[PDB]
Design a binder for this molecule. Structure first.
Ligand SMILES: [Mg+2]
Ligand SMILES: [Mg+2]
Ligand SMILES: [Mg+2]
Ligand SMILES: [Mg+2]
Ligand SMILES: [Mg+2]
Ligand SMILES: [Mg+2]
Ligand SMILES: [Mg+2]
Ligand SMILES: [Mg+2]
Ligand SMILES: [Mg+2]
Ligand SMILES: [Mg+2]
Ligand SMILES: [Mg+2]
Lengths: 100, 47, 122, 58, 82, 50
RNA sequence: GUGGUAAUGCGAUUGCCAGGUAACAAAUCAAUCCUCCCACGGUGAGCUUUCUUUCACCAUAAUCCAUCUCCGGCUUUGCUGGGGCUUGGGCCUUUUUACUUCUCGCGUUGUUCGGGGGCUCAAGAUUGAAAAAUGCAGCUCUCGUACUGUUUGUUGUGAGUUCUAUUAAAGCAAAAACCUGGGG
RNA sequence: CCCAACUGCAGACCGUACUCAUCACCGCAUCAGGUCCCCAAGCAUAGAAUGCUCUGGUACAUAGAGAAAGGUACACUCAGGGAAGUCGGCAAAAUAGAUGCGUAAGUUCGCAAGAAGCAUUGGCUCUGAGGGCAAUUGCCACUCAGAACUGCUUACGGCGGGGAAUCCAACUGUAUAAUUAAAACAUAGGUUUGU
RNA sequence: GGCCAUAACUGAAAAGGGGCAACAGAGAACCUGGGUUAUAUUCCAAAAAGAAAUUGCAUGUGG
RNA sequence: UAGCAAAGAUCUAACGGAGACGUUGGAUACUGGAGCGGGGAAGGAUUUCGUGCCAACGGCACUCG
RNA sequence: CGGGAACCCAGGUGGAGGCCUGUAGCGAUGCUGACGUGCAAAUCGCUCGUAUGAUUUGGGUAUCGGAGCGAAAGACUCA
């Protein structure tokens, strides 16, 4: 049940990160999040949920961390704010963005 | 060179590295025992 | 104005080599004021003299075949170019296949058959 | 470098006359005693509160 | 990034004497000499030249300082005869 | 390349010093005959071999 | 100098003789090493109209210490011995192989030795020191400032180790220093 | 008494930059020549072949504007014929890898021989076996074999033209650096002479 | 006048005079980390950046 | 005038400069691990480095060597 | 070794060889190629010979002028 979260720095408060943004971090976390074999629907394979900003999931199979670092880097590119923040694993299991 | 230092500049010398330059002139680097500050001799010797 | 010195030793501080050090072009008087490999180490710490990433020499083309050449789709009559005793040696398909017939008969002197004249008869 | 496997022989060879320094070390999963004699450094690594004891005086 | 290496010392020849390639804690992979592992203490060549048991193959420096019981058994003609 | 005797080293050092120009306080001397050094070696042109 | 039936263990010295090391062409073949690959898991940057994860990084020096306990005995107060890592050797002890048996290696051969324990031997790993404050590096923040990660497994090729075959009317240097012994 | 281990002091001389080459050396020179050694990545591939790439290195070898003829090429094709060219198949083509099938004359039995000569080659999904870990099916292998499928009879690079004879030399070898690589020298073999 | 100690100057056997010749043979006590415009297995000074090995002479704990 | 024809094709920005030149960035390349690589011996002996400089030398040029 | 009173029929193993293809290395056959006021006082290209060897190569070391050395071309001995 690895809990691989995701943070939100000033590009959450100062940057435009709201339901219009994080609701794409909810859809893509199911619509862009791949699954075993067939990819897509992310509810029956590995448990995930949302919080204030921590986007930890609960998977009990082979399940990486740099995986989310580009799913978000594809979400941080589907918002064109690839320069407005850089994803970074500031912890030991969760990533923490920061501006430049 | 160590003996000469101590006879000329009353300081200790630990490591005296030498080299015969491409001028036939033998240079000498001289550690001053960490107890005689070198910057207090160049100012004494007038370097 | 010329940044040859600051570029020569920043490649000797980053320990990468040229075409890896990126001297920021939008400012040269910043770089030109270095003139020393400690004043350049400070510059490297700042924005001005990054080392650009090396390159991406792909290898997924190879692992595409390495995936398609362990279970099947190996070479064919027209892909071979060297003799079979040069591709798959003859002297080592005997060697292994004979290690195995001996690694198996020493296994069968533990508790298997008589092992005197049903081992060395064989 | 030798690693003193003793509390008596160490406290003997650690309290010798050379004693260039005794660098108290803190590392994960242990606590290490580096005495610097003239020619070796003798370590005594330990897993106990005995580290802070023989740290104050030795 | 596959670095190549140098003969660090002043001999740059591949004689059976040098025979140097190790990774470094600074990841600066660089190569060092070996010792030429000498054959050990043997019986006389006339008498079936064989290695002596209980004896080591120490080199001229290891042999010149190690103890005497690393090169001879406690028999008579120990370290010369098996 | 890296091996030169010290004596052979003392003889190239005596040539590195002889390869300096005439200083511009010599040609205002009263009656000298020197305008150029006319013994300047260039390492490519001519070799010493000692 | 003193112990083990024995292989041989251990402890702190000046002249002759005898050995030994130095000291040996190339081969073929099996582990470390390093190179590279792959599966790993972790970090940084790259791709993104798209499609996807590509690439990088992940390091351990000389010189040392001892094979942790399996076990006596799962730590009483801990003995009888602190032996062990394995695979290639050379041996040792003890019991055997004659009906031709047998042991072999990829291989041209060994016995006239076949198993159980031991003694060493050189590769070589291992824990420990060196050694992480190093180093690579990202980072949360703001050369200061802190800390979060400090990962090994697989393959393949190779250099040496391994076995002082083969061409030999070719048999594949010498010596110092050094080492051991006999007499001392 | 003697040695070790622990300390203590000291550890001298010379070399050390740079170069090692399409700019550093020799060649008269910043010369397409010559020049010893080490380190040596990925993929195709028998692979230090050759082709292309990551590292490292380098794009200051005069540059520009153009359709002459003529010329030089590690440049090509060319209808039909195919050595009629020429002193002469010189040059060029052609041959080609792999695998399978076959392979004469002669012969010093080793060879000739890759003889000659045919045949198949792709891509794809497969199905076969081929192995290390214990009371029988568990986990850590890319090699070959076959099947159909589909499509080129049009496809980097690298890669023998072959046969029949005659002559000479037995052979590998050496050798006229700067016009002669041979049938010459050598050679093994044979004999001779001296001693 | 001998405990003990340096030294002089003799002189104990001991055949085969010396001496060169190898920056690829032999031999050879050091390894990482890092702070030069250009040197580093060469430099770093005292929380030697460290860690070793090693030769000479010494004092001394072990018999 | 012959020629400067074997061996790597420079292209651009903005910058410097008294001005085809240099530097930096980006781009496309070439060497291709028997290398236009990194180290040495032989040999050379300051060619190293930096800062200038640009008269003549680098067979074109140069702000560069 | 298999298989059948002589020693043949085959199956492997092993990896010899002044053997073969071929890289470097060392040579220089053809083009009588290109150069011939060269790149060069002998070079360049392609082809080509050999490439475990009577091999190639480094340093040291021997032997030289009425002489040396030569698998012998009167070749070579600092153009
Ligand atoms: Mg020996
Ligand atoms: Mg021998
Ligand atoms: Mg194997
Ligand atoms: Mg001898
Ligand atoms: Mg040249
Ligand atoms: Mg000359
Ligand atoms: Mg490149
Ligand atoms: Mg035609
Ligand atoms: Mg026809
Ligand atoms: Mg050839
Ligand atoms: Mg030499």
């Amino acid at each position: 049940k690895k809990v691989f979260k995701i943070d939100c720095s000033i590009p959450a408060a100062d940057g435009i990160f709201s339901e219009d943004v994080l609701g794409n971090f909810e859809q893509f976390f199911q619509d862009n999040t791949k699954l075993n074999g067939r990819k897509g629907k992310l509810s029956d394979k590995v448990r995930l949920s949302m919080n204030d900003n921590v986007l930890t999931i609960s998977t009990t199979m082979a399940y990486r961390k740099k995986y989310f670092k580009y799913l978000t880097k594809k979400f941080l590119k589907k918002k064109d704010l690839r320069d407005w923040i850089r994803i970074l694993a500031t912890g030991k299991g969760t990533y923490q963005l920061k501006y430049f | 060179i160590k003996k000469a230092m101590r006879k000329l500049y009353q300081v200790k010398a630990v490591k005296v590295n030498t080299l015969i330059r491409p001028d036939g002139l033998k240079k000498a680097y001289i550690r001053l025992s960490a107890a005689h500050d070198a910057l207090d001799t160049a100012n004494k010797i007038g370097l | 104005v010329s940044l040859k010195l600051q570029a020569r030793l920043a490649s000797s501080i980053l320990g990468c080599g040229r075409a890896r050090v990126w001297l920021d072009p939008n400012e040269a008087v910043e770089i030109q004021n270095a003139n020393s490999r400690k004043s350049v180490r400070k510059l490297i710490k700042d924005g001005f003299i990054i080392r650009k990433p090396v390159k991406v020499h792909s290898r997924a083309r190879w692992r595409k075949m390495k995936e398609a050449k362990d279970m099947g789709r190996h070479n064919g009559v027209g892909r071979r170019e060297g003799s079979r005793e040069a591709r798959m040696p003859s002297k080592e398909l005997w060697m292994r296949r004979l290690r195995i017939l001996r690694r198996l008969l020493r296994k069968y002197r533990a508790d298997k058959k008589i092992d005197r004249h049903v081992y060395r008869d064989l | 470098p030798r690693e003193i496997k003793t509390l008596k022989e160490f406290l003997a060879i650690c309290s010798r006359k050379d004693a260039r320094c005794v660098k108290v070390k803190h590392n994960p999963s242990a606590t290490k005693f580096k005495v610097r004699c003239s020619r070796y450094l003798y370590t005594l690594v330990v897993n106990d509160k005995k580290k802070a004891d023989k740290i104050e005086r030795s | 990034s596959c670095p190549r290496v140098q003969y660090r010392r002043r001999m740059h020849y591949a004689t059976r004497g040098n025979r140097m390639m190790v990774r470094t804690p600074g990841n600066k992979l660089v190569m060092q000499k070996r010792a030429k592992r000498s054959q050990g203490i043997h019986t006389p060549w006339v008498l079936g030249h064989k290695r002596l048991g209980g004896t080591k193959a120490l080199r001229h420096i290891d042999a010149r300082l190690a103890s005497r019981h690393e090169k001879s058994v406690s028999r008579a003609y120990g370290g010369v005869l098996s | 390349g890296r091996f030169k005797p010290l004596a052979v080293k003392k003889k190239y050092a005596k040539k590195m010093n002889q390869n300096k120009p005439v200083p511009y306080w010599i040609r205002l001397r009263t009656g000298n005959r020197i305008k150029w050094n006319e013994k300047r070696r260039h390492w490519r042109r001519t070799k010493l071999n000692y």
